[PDB]
Design a protein around this ligand. Structure first.
Ligand SMILES: Nc1ncnc2c1ncn2[C@@H]1O[C@H](COP(=O)(O)OP(=O)(O)O)[C@@H](O)[C@H]1O
Ligand SMILES: [Cl-]
Ligand SMILES: [Cl-]
Ligand SMILES: [Mn+2]
Lengths: 582, 14
Protein backbone atom coordinates (compact mmCIF):
# COMPACT_ATOMS: atom_id res chain seq x y z
CA UNK A 1 0.00 0.00 0.00
CA UNK A 2 1.77 3.09 1.34
CA UNK A 3 5.58 3.17 1.27
CA UNK A 4 8.27 5.45 2.71
CA UNK A 5 10.87 6.48 0.12
CA UNK A 6 14.30 6.63 1.72
CA UNK A 7 17.62 8.06 0.53
CA UNK A 8 20.82 6.18 1.42
CA UNK A 9 23.72 8.22 2.77
CA UNK A 10 27.25 6.98 3.49
CA UNK A 11 25.98 5.13 6.58
CA UNK A 12 22.58 6.70 7.33
CA UNK A 13 19.10 6.86 5.76
CA UNK A 14 16.52 9.68 5.48
CA UNK A 15 12.91 9.88 4.25
CA UNK A 16 12.55 12.19 1.23
CA UNK A 17 8.84 11.52 0.58
CA UNK A 18 6.01 8.98 0.31
CA UNK A 19 4.63 6.72 -2.47
CA UNK A 20 1.73 4.32 -3.16
CA UNK A 21 1.61 0.79 -4.65
CA UNK A 22 -1.59 -0.79 -6.05
CA UNK A 23 -0.41 -2.76 -7.99
CA UNK A 24 1.47 -2.91 -10.22
CA UNK A 25 2.23 0.81 -10.23
CA UNK A 26 4.14 2.89 -7.67
CA UNK A 27 2.85 6.46 -7.44
CA UNK A 28 4.62 9.50 -5.97
CA UNK A 29 5.42 13.14 -6.84
CA UNK A 30 8.18 14.09 -9.31
CA UNK A 31 10.32 16.29 -7.01
CA UNK A 32 10.70 13.40 -4.52
CA UNK A 33 12.56 11.03 -6.89
CA UNK A 34 13.50 13.17 -9.93
CA UNK A 35 13.10 10.06 -12.11
CA UNK A 36 15.58 7.89 -10.17
CA UNK A 37 15.25 4.13 -9.63
CA UNK A 38 13.87 2.74 -6.35
CA UNK A 39 14.13 -0.86 -5.11
CA UNK A 40 12.79 -3.18 -2.40
CA UNK A 41 14.85 -6.07 -3.86
CA UNK A 42 14.32 -2.23 -9.24
CA UNK A 43 11.45 0.07 -10.28
CA UNK A 44 11.85 2.06 -13.52
CA UNK A 45 9.97 5.33 -14.26
CA UNK A 46 7.43 4.80 -17.06
CA UNK A 47 5.20 7.90 -16.78
CA UNK A 48 5.81 11.43 -15.47
CA UNK A 49 4.42 14.99 -15.32
CA UNK A 50 6.94 17.70 -14.36
CA UNK A 51 4.58 20.71 -14.46
CA UNK A 52 1.95 19.17 -12.16
CA UNK A 53 4.61 17.24 -10.17
CA UNK A 54 3.58 13.57 -10.60
CA UNK A 55 5.43 10.33 -11.50
CA UNK A 56 4.66 6.58 -11.67
CA UNK A 57 6.71 3.35 -11.69
CA UNK A 58 5.94 0.01 -13.36
CA UNK A 59 3.12 1.31 -15.57
CA UNK A 60 0.46 3.98 -16.10
CA UNK A 61 -1.34 6.03 -13.43
CA UNK A 62 -3.55 3.44 -11.68
CA UNK A 63 -5.38 5.68 -9.18
CA UNK A 64 -8.11 7.36 -11.24
CA UNK A 65 -10.41 8.30 -8.35
CA UNK A 66 -11.21 11.95 -7.62
CA UNK A 67 -12.65 14.11 -4.83
CA UNK A 68 -16.41 14.64 -5.32
CA UNK A 69 -16.02 18.34 -4.32
CA UNK A 70 -18.25 17.98 -1.23
CA UNK A 71 -17.25 15.31 1.29
CA UNK A 72 -14.49 14.76 3.86
CA UNK A 73 -11.16 13.08 3.07
CA UNK A 74 -8.40 11.45 5.11
CA UNK A 75 -4.76 12.34 4.58
CA UNK A 76 -2.84 9.18 5.49
CA UNK A 77 0.20 11.22 6.50
CA UNK A 78 3.44 9.24 6.63
CA UNK A 79 5.72 11.62 8.52
CA UNK A 80 9.40 10.60 8.84
CA UNK A 81 10.32 9.07 12.22
CA UNK A 82 6.63 9.12 13.11
CA UNK A 83 3.78 6.60 13.08
CA UNK A 84 1.25 6.64 10.20
CA UNK A 85 -1.57 9.01 11.17
CA UNK A 86 -4.97 9.33 9.51
CA UNK A 87 -6.22 12.93 9.58
CA UNK A 88 -9.75 13.77 8.41
CA UNK A 89 -10.46 17.23 6.97
CA UNK A 90 -12.68 19.11 4.51
CA UNK A 91 -10.99 20.39 1.34
CA UNK A 92 -11.97 23.64 -0.41
CA UNK A 93 -11.96 25.06 -3.95
CA UNK A 94 -9.58 27.87 -4.99
CA UNK A 95 -10.05 25.44 -9.89
CA UNK A 96 -7.90 23.25 -7.62
CA UNK A 97 -8.81 20.96 -4.72
CA UNK A 98 -6.71 21.70 -1.64
CA UNK A 99 -6.40 20.67 2.03
CA UNK A 100 -5.69 23.08 4.90
CA UNK A 101 -3.40 20.63 6.75
CA UNK A 102 0.36 21.11 7.19
CA UNK A 103 2.81 18.22 7.66
CA UNK A 104 6.59 18.51 8.04
CA UNK A 105 9.23 17.86 5.29
CA UNK A 106 9.44 14.23 4.09
CA UNK A 107 5.67 13.62 4.05
CA UNK A 108 5.24 14.80 0.42
CA UNK A 109 3.37 12.16 -1.60
CA UNK A 110 1.15 11.01 1.26
CA UNK A 111 -2.18 9.51 0.09
CA UNK A 112 -5.45 11.39 0.54
CA UNK A 113 -8.12 8.72 1.04
CA UNK A 114 -11.70 8.64 -0.30
CA UNK A 115 -14.84 7.90 1.73
CA UNK A 116 -14.35 5.00 1.57
CA UNK A 117 -11.72 4.42 0.61
CA UNK A 118 -9.57 4.78 -2.51
CA UNK A 119 -6.78 7.37 -2.94
CA UNK A 120 -8.07 10.57 -4.59
CA UNK A 121 -4.82 12.57 -4.56
CA UNK A 122 -1.41 13.13 -3.00
CA UNK A 123 -0.52 15.52 -0.18
CA UNK A 124 2.21 18.08 -0.88
CA UNK A 125 2.91 21.30 -2.82
CA UNK A 126 -2.85 26.09 0.93
CA UNK A 127 -1.58 22.53 0.38
CA UNK A 128 -2.80 21.20 -2.98
CA UNK A 129 -4.44 17.84 -3.71
CA UNK A 130 -2.35 16.69 -6.69
CA UNK A 131 -4.12 14.13 -8.90
CA UNK A 132 -3.72 13.11 -12.55
CA UNK A 133 -6.68 13.32 -14.95
CA UNK A 134 -5.26 10.60 -17.22
CA UNK A 135 -5.77 6.85 -17.71
CA UNK A 136 -2.38 5.35 -18.61
CA UNK A 137 -0.46 5.35 -20.68
CA UNK A 138 2.33 4.73 -19.46
CA UNK A 139 4.70 6.09 -22.15
CA UNK A 140 6.16 4.44 -25.24
CA UNK A 141 9.78 5.43 -25.63
CA UNK A 142 10.36 3.70 -28.97
CA UNK A 143 13.33 1.31 -28.77
CA UNK A 144 15.44 2.11 -31.84
CA UNK A 145 16.86 -1.42 -31.98
CA UNK A 146 13.50 -2.62 -33.37
CA UNK A 147 14.49 -0.86 -36.64
CA UNK A 148 17.76 -2.77 -37.17
CA UNK A 149 17.86 -5.01 -40.23
CA UNK A 150 17.83 -8.74 -39.39
CA UNK A 151 15.82 -8.05 -36.23
CA UNK A 152 12.31 -9.38 -35.59
CA UNK A 153 10.43 -8.08 -32.56
CA UNK A 154 7.31 -9.63 -31.10
CA UNK A 155 5.35 -6.83 -29.45
CA UNK A 156 3.29 -8.96 -27.05
CA UNK A 157 1.74 -6.46 -24.61
CA UNK A 158 -1.61 -7.80 -23.30
CA UNK A 159 -4.93 -7.24 -25.16
CA UNK A 160 -5.98 -3.57 -24.87
CA UNK A 161 -2.52 -2.40 -23.93
CA UNK A 162 -2.58 -0.14 -26.94
CA UNK A 163 -0.53 -1.85 -29.58
CA UNK A 164 -2.63 -0.86 -32.55
CA UNK A 165 -3.95 2.52 -31.42
CA UNK A 166 -0.99 3.94 -29.50
CA UNK A 167 2.27 2.07 -30.17
CA UNK A 168 1.80 1.50 -33.91
CA UNK A 169 1.30 5.18 -34.81
CA UNK A 170 4.33 6.07 -32.66
CA UNK A 171 6.47 3.52 -34.54
CA UNK A 172 5.24 4.74 -37.96
CA UNK A 173 5.96 8.35 -36.96
CA UNK A 174 9.44 7.23 -35.86
CA UNK A 175 10.09 5.11 -38.96
CA UNK A 176 9.13 8.07 -41.15
CA UNK A 177 11.76 10.18 -39.37
CA UNK A 178 14.34 7.48 -40.14
CA UNK A 179 13.18 7.50 -43.80
CA UNK A 180 12.40 3.77 -43.74
CA UNK A 181 10.26 2.12 -46.42
CA UNK A 182 7.37 1.00 -44.21
CA UNK A 183 4.65 -1.61 -44.65
CA UNK A 184 1.75 -1.96 -42.17
CA UNK A 185 -0.36 -5.15 -42.30
CA UNK A 186 -3.93 -5.28 -40.98
CA UNK A 187 -6.00 -8.48 -40.62
CA UNK A 188 -9.12 -7.21 -42.45
CA UNK A 189 -10.13 -4.17 -44.55
CA UNK A 190 -12.44 -2.68 -41.88
CA UNK A 191 -9.64 -2.99 -39.32
CA UNK A 192 -7.28 -1.32 -41.82
CA UNK A 193 -9.95 1.38 -42.29
CA UNK A 194 -9.93 1.92 -38.51
CA UNK A 195 -6.11 2.13 -38.56
CA UNK A 196 -6.33 4.74 -41.36
CA UNK A 197 -8.20 7.14 -39.06
CA UNK A 198 -5.87 6.60 -36.08
CA UNK A 199 -2.87 7.43 -38.30
CA UNK A 200 -4.27 10.89 -39.11
CA UNK A 201 -1.83 13.42 -40.58
CA UNK A 202 0.59 10.68 -41.64
CA UNK A 203 1.20 9.79 -45.32
CA UNK A 204 -0.41 6.33 -45.27
CA UNK A 205 -1.69 4.70 -48.47
CA UNK A 206 -4.21 1.86 -48.45
CA UNK A 207 -3.36 -0.87 -50.95
CA UNK A 208 -6.02 -3.10 -52.55
CA UNK A 209 -5.52 -6.69 -53.84
CA UNK A 210 -6.81 -5.55 -57.29
CA UNK A 211 -3.42 -3.87 -57.82
CA UNK A 212 -0.31 -6.07 -57.97
CA UNK A 213 2.15 -3.30 -57.01
CA UNK A 214 2.04 0.48 -56.49
CA UNK A 215 5.24 2.52 -56.29
CA UNK A 216 4.99 6.32 -55.96
CA UNK A 217 8.62 7.21 -55.22
CA UNK A 218 7.35 9.41 -52.38
CA UNK A 219 7.91 9.07 -48.63
CA UNK A 220 4.78 6.99 -48.04
CA UNK A 221 3.62 4.18 -45.75
CA UNK A 222 1.75 1.28 -47.35
CA UNK A 223 -1.23 -0.13 -45.46
CA UNK A 224 -2.82 -3.41 -46.60
CA UNK A 225 -4.48 -6.64 -45.44
CA UNK A 226 -2.30 -9.63 -44.50
CA UNK A 227 -3.83 -11.40 -47.53
CA UNK A 228 -3.18 -8.51 -49.94
CA UNK A 229 0.55 -8.71 -49.20
CA UNK A 230 0.63 -12.48 -49.89
CA UNK A 231 -1.39 -12.09 -53.11
CA UNK A 232 0.96 -9.39 -54.43
CA UNK A 233 3.92 -11.70 -53.67
CA UNK A 234 2.39 -14.49 -55.77
CA UNK A 235 1.44 -12.21 -58.68
CA UNK A 236 3.67 -9.11 -58.86
CA UNK A 237 6.72 -8.90 -61.08
CA UNK A 238 8.19 -6.39 -58.58
CA UNK A 239 10.08 -7.21 -55.39
CA UNK A 240 8.71 -5.03 -52.55
CA UNK A 241 11.81 -3.78 -50.75
CA UNK A 242 10.30 -2.54 -47.48
CA UNK A 243 12.94 -2.41 -44.75
CA UNK A 244 10.30 -2.28 -41.98
CA UNK A 245 7.21 -4.47 -41.89
CA UNK A 246 4.68 -4.18 -39.08
CA UNK A 247 2.12 -6.98 -38.96
CA UNK A 248 -0.74 -6.15 -36.59
CA UNK A 249 -2.93 -8.90 -35.07
CA UNK A 250 -0.15 -11.36 -35.97
CA UNK A 251 -1.99 -14.29 -34.29
CA UNK A 252 -4.21 -14.60 -37.41
CA UNK A 253 -3.94 -18.26 -38.51
CA UNK A 254 -5.60 -17.94 -41.90
CA UNK A 255 -3.13 -19.40 -44.52
CA UNK A 256 -2.41 -16.00 -46.07
CA UNK A 257 -1.37 -14.55 -42.68
CA UNK A 258 0.74 -17.60 -41.87
CA UNK A 259 2.45 -17.41 -45.27
CA UNK A 260 3.02 -13.66 -44.75
CA UNK A 261 4.80 -14.25 -41.43
CA UNK A 262 7.05 -16.81 -43.10
CA UNK A 263 7.94 -14.45 -45.94
CA UNK A 264 8.54 -11.52 -43.57
CA UNK A 265 10.70 -13.85 -41.47
CA UNK A 266 12.71 -14.91 -44.54
CA UNK A 267 13.13 -11.22 -45.40
CA UNK A 268 14.44 -10.55 -41.90
CA UNK A 269 16.82 -13.53 -42.16
CA UNK A 270 18.21 -12.36 -45.53
CA UNK A 271 19.05 -9.04 -43.82
CA UNK A 272 16.78 -6.85 -45.95
CA UNK A 273 14.25 -5.82 -43.28
CA UNK A 274 13.30 -5.26 -39.68
CA UNK A 275 9.98 -6.83 -38.68
CA UNK A 276 7.47 -6.34 -35.89
CA UNK A 277 4.68 -8.79 -35.04
CA UNK A 278 2.04 -7.25 -32.82
CA UNK A 279 0.01 -9.72 -30.78
CA UNK A 280 -0.63 -10.51 -27.14
CA UNK A 281 -0.91 -14.15 -28.27
CA UNK A 282 2.08 -15.10 -30.46
CA UNK A 283 2.57 -18.70 -31.70
CA UNK A 284 2.85 -21.04 -28.71
CA UNK A 285 0.59 -19.06 -26.37
CA UNK A 286 -0.70 -21.13 -23.45
CA UNK A 287 -2.45 -18.59 -21.20
CA UNK A 288 -6.21 -18.28 -21.84
CA UNK A 289 -6.65 -15.66 -19.08
CA UNK A 290 -4.19 -12.80 -19.77
CA UNK A 291 -4.03 -9.31 -18.19
CA UNK A 292 -6.76 -6.80 -19.11
CA UNK A 293 -7.24 -3.02 -18.67
CA UNK A 294 -10.21 -3.67 -16.38
CA UNK A 295 -11.10 -6.67 -14.20
CA UNK A 296 -12.87 -9.52 -15.98
CA UNK A 297 -15.31 -11.89 -14.34
CA UNK A 298 -14.47 -15.34 -15.72
CA UNK A 299 -17.68 -17.35 -15.45
CA UNK A 300 -17.70 -21.06 -16.29
CA UNK A 301 -21.04 -22.66 -17.16
CA UNK A 302 -22.97 -24.64 -19.80
CA UNK A 303 -23.59 -22.71 -23.02
CA UNK A 304 -26.15 -23.78 -25.66
CA UNK A 305 -24.92 -25.26 -28.95
CA UNK A 306 -28.19 -24.54 -30.76
CA UNK A 307 -31.72 -23.24 -30.07
CA UNK A 308 -32.81 -23.64 -26.43
CA UNK A 309 -36.27 -23.63 -24.81
CA UNK A 310 -35.39 -23.28 -21.07
CA UNK A 311 -32.53 -23.33 -18.55
CA UNK A 312 -30.42 -20.45 -19.86
CA UNK A 313 -32.38 -17.45 -18.54
CA UNK A 314 -29.01 -15.87 -17.69
CA UNK A 315 -28.41 -15.38 -21.44
CA UNK A 316 -31.42 -13.20 -22.16
CA UNK A 317 -31.84 -11.66 -18.68
CA UNK A 318 -28.44 -9.96 -19.04
CA UNK A 319 -28.90 -6.19 -19.45
CA UNK A 320 -25.85 -5.20 -21.53
CA UNK A 321 -24.39 -6.16 -24.91
CA UNK A 322 -22.93 -9.60 -25.65
CA UNK A 323 -20.41 -10.93 -28.16
CA UNK A 324 -21.02 -14.64 -28.70
CA UNK A 325 -18.40 -16.77 -30.47
CA UNK A 326 -19.78 -19.67 -32.51
CA UNK A 327 -17.89 -22.56 -34.19
CA UNK A 328 -19.58 -22.01 -37.58
CA UNK A 329 -21.95 -19.85 -39.62
CA UNK A 330 -24.63 -22.57 -39.34
CA UNK A 331 -24.25 -22.72 -35.55
CA UNK A 332 -24.44 -18.92 -35.60
CA UNK A 333 -27.65 -19.11 -37.66
CA UNK A 334 -29.21 -21.35 -35.00
CA UNK A 335 -28.14 -19.19 -32.09
CA UNK A 336 -29.16 -15.92 -33.81
CA UNK A 337 -32.59 -17.35 -34.73
CA UNK A 338 -33.16 -18.38 -31.10
CA UNK A 339 -32.15 -14.94 -29.75
CA UNK A 340 -34.43 -13.09 -32.21
CA UNK A 341 -37.33 -15.30 -31.07
CA UNK A 342 -36.95 -13.62 -27.66
CA UNK A 343 -36.97 -10.23 -29.43
CA UNK A 344 -33.18 -9.73 -29.25
CA UNK A 345 -31.43 -7.59 -31.87
CA UNK A 346 -28.57 -9.59 -33.36
CA UNK A 347 -25.75 -8.87 -35.80
CA UNK A 348 -24.00 -11.85 -37.39
CA UNK A 349 -20.33 -11.78 -38.32
CA UNK A 350 -18.27 -14.08 -40.53
CA UNK A 351 -15.24 -13.66 -42.80
CA UNK A 352 -17.25 -13.04 -45.97
CA UNK A 353 -19.83 -10.75 -44.35
CA UNK A 354 -17.43 -8.96 -41.99
CA UNK A 355 -16.88 -5.97 -44.31
CA UNK A 356 -20.58 -5.10 -44.56
CA UNK A 357 -21.77 -6.27 -41.13
CA UNK A 358 -19.02 -5.10 -38.71
CA UNK A 359 -19.57 -1.39 -39.49
CA UNK A 360 -23.17 -1.85 -38.30
CA UNK A 361 -21.96 -2.87 -34.81
CA UNK A 362 -20.95 0.80 -34.45
CA UNK A 363 -23.67 2.92 -36.16
CA UNK A 364 -26.74 0.83 -35.26
CA UNK A 365 -27.85 -0.55 -31.92
CA UNK A 366 -27.85 -4.23 -31.04
CA UNK A 367 -28.01 -6.69 -28.13
CA UNK A 368 -25.90 -9.56 -29.44
CA UNK A 369 -23.16 -10.00 -31.98
CA UNK A 370 -22.95 -13.66 -33.03
CA UNK A 371 -19.54 -14.19 -34.65
CA UNK A 372 -17.03 -16.74 -35.92
CA UNK A 373 -13.36 -16.63 -34.85
CA UNK A 374 -12.79 -13.71 -37.29
CA UNK A 375 -13.61 -11.30 -34.43
CA UNK A 376 -10.44 -12.44 -32.60
CA UNK A 377 -8.43 -10.29 -35.05
CA UNK A 378 -8.71 -6.73 -33.69
CA UNK A 379 -12.52 -6.48 -33.83
CA UNK A 380 -13.55 -3.87 -31.25
CA UNK A 381 -16.95 -4.03 -29.52
CA UNK A 382 -18.52 -1.69 -26.98
CA UNK A 383 -19.84 -4.72 -25.06
CA UNK A 384 -19.92 -6.01 -21.49
CA UNK A 385 -20.05 -9.78 -22.04
CA UNK A 386 -18.40 -12.48 -24.11
CA UNK A 387 -20.12 -15.83 -24.43
CA UNK A 388 -17.45 -18.34 -25.42
CA UNK A 389 -18.24 -22.07 -25.69
CA UNK A 390 -14.59 -22.25 -26.86
CA UNK A 391 -15.49 -24.24 -29.95
CA UNK A 392 -14.44 -24.05 -33.61
CA UNK A 393 -14.39 -25.95 -36.89
CA UNK A 394 -11.02 -27.15 -38.18
CA UNK A 395 -10.31 -27.71 -41.87
CA UNK A 396 -8.40 -30.97 -42.31
CA UNK A 397 -6.88 -32.52 -45.41
CA UNK A 398 -7.91 -36.18 -45.45
CA UNK A 399 -5.60 -38.68 -47.15
CA UNK A 400 -7.71 -41.72 -46.24
CA UNK A 401 -8.46 -42.62 -49.85
CA UNK A 402 -9.20 -39.77 -52.29
CA UNK A 403 -7.85 -36.43 -51.04
CA UNK A 404 -10.50 -34.02 -49.74
CA UNK A 405 -10.92 -31.18 -47.25
CA UNK A 406 -13.46 -31.55 -44.44
CA UNK A 407 -14.49 -29.22 -41.64
CA UNK A 408 -13.80 -31.29 -38.51
CA UNK A 409 -15.49 -30.68 -35.16
CA UNK A 410 -16.67 -28.50 -33.62
CA UNK A 411 -13.53 -28.95 -31.51
CA UNK A 412 -11.90 -26.93 -28.68
CA UNK A 413 -10.13 -23.70 -29.65
CA UNK A 414 -6.43 -23.02 -29.01
CA UNK A 415 -5.52 -21.20 -25.78
CA UNK A 416 -4.53 -18.24 -28.01
CA UNK A 417 -8.04 -18.12 -29.47
CA UNK A 418 -9.73 -18.32 -26.05
CA UNK A 419 -7.60 -15.39 -24.86
CA UNK A 420 -8.40 -13.25 -27.92
CA UNK A 421 -12.11 -14.04 -27.59
CA UNK A 422 -12.08 -13.17 -23.87
CA UNK A 423 -9.95 -10.18 -24.86
CA UNK A 424 -12.88 -8.44 -26.61
CA UNK A 425 -13.99 -7.18 -23.20
CA UNK A 426 -12.33 -5.74 -20.09
CA UNK A 427 -10.67 -3.23 -22.45
CA UNK A 428 -12.44 -0.17 -21.05
CA UNK A 429 -10.96 1.25 -17.78
CA UNK A 430 -14.26 3.04 -17.03
CA UNK A 431 -16.17 -0.28 -17.15
CA UNK A 432 -15.15 -2.75 -14.44
CA UNK A 433 -17.74 -5.57 -14.49
CA UNK A 434 -17.30 -7.09 -17.94
CA UNK A 435 -17.91 -10.84 -18.09
CA UNK A 436 -16.28 -13.74 -19.84
CA UNK A 437 -18.72 -16.64 -19.81
CA UNK A 438 -17.07 -19.79 -21.14
CA UNK A 439 -17.28 -23.57 -21.32
CA UNK A 440 -14.62 -26.28 -21.66
CA UNK A 441 -10.83 -26.43 -21.79
CA UNK A 442 -8.86 -25.12 -24.78
CA UNK A 443 -6.70 -27.51 -26.86
CA UNK A 444 -3.08 -26.81 -27.91
CA UNK A 445 -2.51 -29.47 -30.56
CA UNK A 446 -3.66 -28.40 -34.02
CA UNK A 447 -0.97 -30.11 -36.15
CA UNK A 448 -3.62 -31.60 -38.49
CA UNK A 449 -4.95 -28.13 -39.39
CA UNK A 450 -5.13 -27.56 -43.15
CA UNK A 451 -3.99 -23.92 -42.81
CA UNK A 452 -0.33 -24.82 -42.16
CA UNK A 453 0.10 -26.99 -45.26
CA UNK A 454 -1.93 -24.46 -47.26
CA UNK A 455 0.49 -21.82 -45.93
CA UNK A 456 3.30 -23.91 -47.45
CA UNK A 457 1.44 -24.08 -50.77
CA UNK A 458 1.53 -20.26 -50.82
CA UNK A 459 5.14 -20.11 -49.59
CA UNK A 460 6.47 -22.70 -52.03
CA UNK A 461 5.14 -20.52 -54.85
CA UNK A 462 6.71 -17.21 -53.88
CA UNK A 463 10.03 -16.81 -55.70
CA UNK A 464 12.82 -14.57 -54.42
CA UNK A 465 15.66 -13.13 -56.56
CA UNK A 466 18.09 -14.68 -54.05
CA UNK A 467 16.80 -18.15 -54.97
CA UNK A 468 15.71 -18.81 -51.38
CA UNK A 469 12.44 -20.68 -50.80
CA UNK A 470 10.52 -18.75 -48.14
CA UNK A 471 9.57 -20.91 -45.16
CA UNK A 472 7.23 -20.80 -42.17
CA UNK A 473 7.97 -18.39 -39.30
CA UNK A 474 10.15 -20.23 -36.72
CA UNK A 475 7.59 -21.08 -33.98
CA UNK A 476 5.13 -22.24 -36.67
CA UNK A 477 7.34 -24.76 -38.51
CA UNK A 478 6.39 -27.76 -36.33
CA UNK A 479 2.73 -27.40 -37.35
CA UNK A 480 3.19 -29.20 -40.68
CA UNK A 481 5.24 -32.20 -41.85
CA UNK A 482 5.28 -30.78 -45.40
CA UNK A 483 8.68 -30.60 -47.11
CA UNK A 484 10.03 -27.21 -48.22
CA UNK A 485 9.35 -26.71 -51.93
CA UNK A 486 7.22 -29.81 -52.45
CA UNK A 487 4.28 -27.58 -53.46
CA UNK A 488 6.26 -25.47 -55.94
CA UNK A 489 4.52 -24.98 -59.26
CA UNK A 490 5.97 -23.41 -62.40
CA UNK A 491 4.85 -21.94 -65.73
CA UNK A 492 1.15 -22.25 -66.46
CA UNK A 493 0.20 -24.40 -63.46
CA UNK A 494 1.70 -21.79 -61.12
CA UNK A 495 -0.11 -18.95 -62.94
CA UNK A 496 -3.43 -20.85 -62.78
CA UNK A 497 -2.92 -21.62 -59.08
CA UNK A 498 -2.61 -17.91 -58.34
CA UNK A 499 -5.56 -17.01 -60.56
CA UNK A 500 -7.92 -19.61 -59.05
CA UNK A 501 -7.32 -17.99 -55.65
CA UNK A 502 -7.17 -14.33 -56.73
CA UNK A 503 -10.07 -14.17 -59.22
CA UNK A 504 -11.70 -17.59 -58.64
CA UNK A 505 -11.83 -16.95 -54.86
CA UNK A 506 -11.19 -20.67 -54.24
CA UNK A 507 -9.43 -22.08 -51.14
CA UNK A 508 -5.68 -22.72 -51.43
CA UNK A 509 -5.87 -26.56 -51.31
CA UNK A 510 -8.55 -26.69 -54.01
CA UNK A 511 -6.82 -24.09 -56.21
CA UNK A 512 -3.63 -26.17 -55.86
CA UNK A 513 -5.46 -29.42 -56.69
CA UNK A 514 -6.98 -28.01 -59.87
CA UNK A 515 -3.88 -26.14 -61.10
CA UNK A 516 -1.44 -29.02 -60.48
CA UNK A 517 -3.80 -31.39 -62.31
CA UNK A 518 -2.95 -29.26 -65.37
CA UNK A 519 -6.39 -27.63 -65.64
CA UNK A 520 -6.65 -24.14 -67.14
CA UNK A 521 -8.52 -21.39 -65.26
CA UNK A 522 -11.55 -21.23 -67.60
CA UNK A 523 -11.99 -25.01 -67.79
CA UNK A 524 -14.79 -25.99 -65.40
CA UNK A 525 -15.34 -29.65 -66.39
CA UNK A 526 -13.87 -30.70 -63.03
CA UNK A 527 -16.84 -29.13 -61.19
CA UNK A 528 -19.04 -31.89 -62.63
CA UNK A 529 -16.64 -34.85 -63.01
CA UNK A 530 -16.72 -35.97 -59.33
CA UNK A 531 -18.06 -39.26 -57.95
CA UNK A 532 -21.52 -39.93 -56.47
CA UNK A 533 -20.50 -38.79 -52.95
CA UNK A 534 -19.13 -35.47 -54.22
CA UNK A 535 -22.64 -34.18 -54.97
CA UNK A 536 -22.93 -30.70 -53.42
CA UNK A 537 -26.02 -29.99 -51.32
CA UNK A 538 -27.61 -26.60 -50.64
CA UNK A 539 -30.42 -26.12 -48.13
CA UNK A 540 -31.21 -29.86 -48.49
CA UNK A 541 -31.26 -29.76 -52.31
CA UNK A 542 -28.81 -31.36 -54.72
CA UNK A 543 -27.25 -28.34 -56.41
CA UNK A 544 -27.68 -28.24 -60.18
CA UNK A 545 -25.80 -25.69 -62.28
CA UNK A 546 -26.68 -24.00 -65.57
CA UNK A 547 -23.26 -24.16 -67.29
CA UNK A 548 -21.44 -21.78 -69.67
CA UNK A 549 -22.60 -23.47 -72.89
CA UNK A 550 -26.19 -24.00 -71.68
CA UNK A 551 -26.16 -27.44 -70.03
CA UNK A 552 -27.93 -28.25 -66.76
CA UNK A 553 -25.46 -30.27 -64.67
CA UNK A 554 -25.26 -31.59 -61.10
CA UNK A 555 -22.66 -29.76 -59.01
CA UNK A 556 -20.27 -32.62 -58.34
CA UNK A 557 -16.60 -31.47 -58.15
CA UNK A 558 -13.65 -33.78 -58.74
CA UNK A 559 -12.04 -32.27 -55.64
CA UNK A 560 -14.20 -31.68 -52.59
CA UNK A 561 -13.35 -28.70 -50.40
CA UNK A 562 -15.93 -28.36 -47.61
CA UNK A 563 -15.20 -24.64 -47.29
CA UNK A 564 -16.81 -23.89 -50.69
CA UNK A 565 -20.11 -25.37 -49.47
CA UNK A 566 -20.16 -24.93 -45.67
CA UNK A 567 -20.12 -21.14 -46.04
CA UNK A 568 -23.35 -19.88 -47.71
CA UNK A 569 -21.49 -16.96 -49.33
CA UNK A 570 -18.79 -19.35 -50.57
CA UNK A 571 -21.43 -21.65 -52.06
CA UNK A 572 -23.06 -18.75 -53.91
CA UNK A 573 -19.60 -17.68 -55.13
CA UNK A 574 -18.68 -21.25 -56.08
CA UNK A 575 -21.89 -21.77 -58.04
CA UNK A 576 -20.96 -18.69 -60.08
CA UNK A 577 -17.48 -20.16 -60.61
CA UNK A 578 -18.91 -23.52 -61.69
CA UNK A 579 -21.29 -21.67 -64.07
CA UNK A 580 -18.35 -20.01 -65.87
CA UNK A 581 -19.38 -16.42 -65.08
CA UNK A 582 -16.38 -15.98 -62.77
CA UNK B 1 21.91 9.10 -3.04
CA UNK B 2 20.27 5.73 -3.83
CA UNK B 3 16.54 5.22 -3.24
CA UNK B 4 14.76 2.42 -1.34
CA UNK B 5 11.26 1.62 -0.01
CA UNK B 6 9.75 0.67 3.37
CA UNK B 7 6.15 -0.31 4.23
CA UNK B 8 4.12 2.11 6.37
CA UNK B 9 0.40 1.22 6.23
CA UNK B 10 -2.45 0.06 3.97
CA UNK B 11 -4.86 2.32 2.04
CA UNK B 12 -7.89 2.57 4.36
CA UNK B 13 -10.29 4.92 6.19
CA UNK B 14 -9.74 5.39 9.96
N1 LIG C 1 -12.35 4.90 -31.15
C1 LIG C 1 -11.84 4.75 -29.90
N2 LIG C 1 -12.00 5.73 -28.97
C2 LIG C 1 -11.50 5.61 -27.72
N3 LIG C 1 -10.82 4.52 -27.30
C3 LIG C 1 -10.59 3.47 -28.13
C4 LIG C 1 -11.10 3.52 -29.51
N4 LIG C 1 -10.74 2.36 -30.09
C5 LIG C 1 -10.06 1.63 -29.17
N5 LIG C 1 -9.97 2.29 -28.00
C6 LIG C 1 -9.31 1.84 -26.75
O1 LIG C 1 -7.89 2.02 -26.84
C7 LIG C 1 -7.23 1.09 -25.99
C8 LIG C 1 -6.11 0.39 -26.75
O2 LIG C 1 -6.66 -0.33 -27.85
P1 LIG C 1 -5.75 -1.19 -28.87
O3 LIG C 1 -4.52 -0.41 -29.21
O4 LIG C 1 -6.65 -1.70 -29.96
O5 LIG C 1 -5.32 -2.43 -27.93
P2 LIG C 1 -4.38 -3.65 -28.41
O6 LIG C 1 -3.15 -3.50 -27.56
O7 LIG C 1 -5.20 -4.87 -28.08
O8 LIG C 1 -4.13 -3.45 -29.89
C9 LIG C 1 -8.30 0.12 -25.50
O9 LIG C 1 -8.64 0.47 -24.15
C10 LIG C 1 -9.49 0.37 -26.40
O10 LIG C 1 -10.74 0.11 -25.75
CL1 LIG D 1 -3.53 -8.69 -29.07
CL1 LIG E 1 -16.05 -17.32 -41.04
MN1 LIG F 1 -4.66 -4.65 -31.66
Amino acid sequence: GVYRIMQRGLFGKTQVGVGIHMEGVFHTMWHVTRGSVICHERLEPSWADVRNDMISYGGGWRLGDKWDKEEDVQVLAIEPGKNPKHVQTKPGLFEIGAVTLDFKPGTSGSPIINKKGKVIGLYGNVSAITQAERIGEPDYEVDEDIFRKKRLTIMDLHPGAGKTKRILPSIVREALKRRLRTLILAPTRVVAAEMEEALRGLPIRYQTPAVKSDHTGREIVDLMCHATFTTRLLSSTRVPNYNLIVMDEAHFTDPCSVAARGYISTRVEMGEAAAIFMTATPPGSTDPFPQSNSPIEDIEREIPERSWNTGFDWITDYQGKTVWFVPSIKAGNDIANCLRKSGKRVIQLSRKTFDTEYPKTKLTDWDFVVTTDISEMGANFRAGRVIDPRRCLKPVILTDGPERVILAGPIPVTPASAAQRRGRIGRNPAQEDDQYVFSGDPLKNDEDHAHWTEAKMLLDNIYTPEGIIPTLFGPEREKTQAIDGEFRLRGEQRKTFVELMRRGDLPVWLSYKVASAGISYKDREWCFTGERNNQILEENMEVEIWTREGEKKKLRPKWLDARVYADPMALKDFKEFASGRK
Amino acid sequence: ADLSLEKAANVQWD
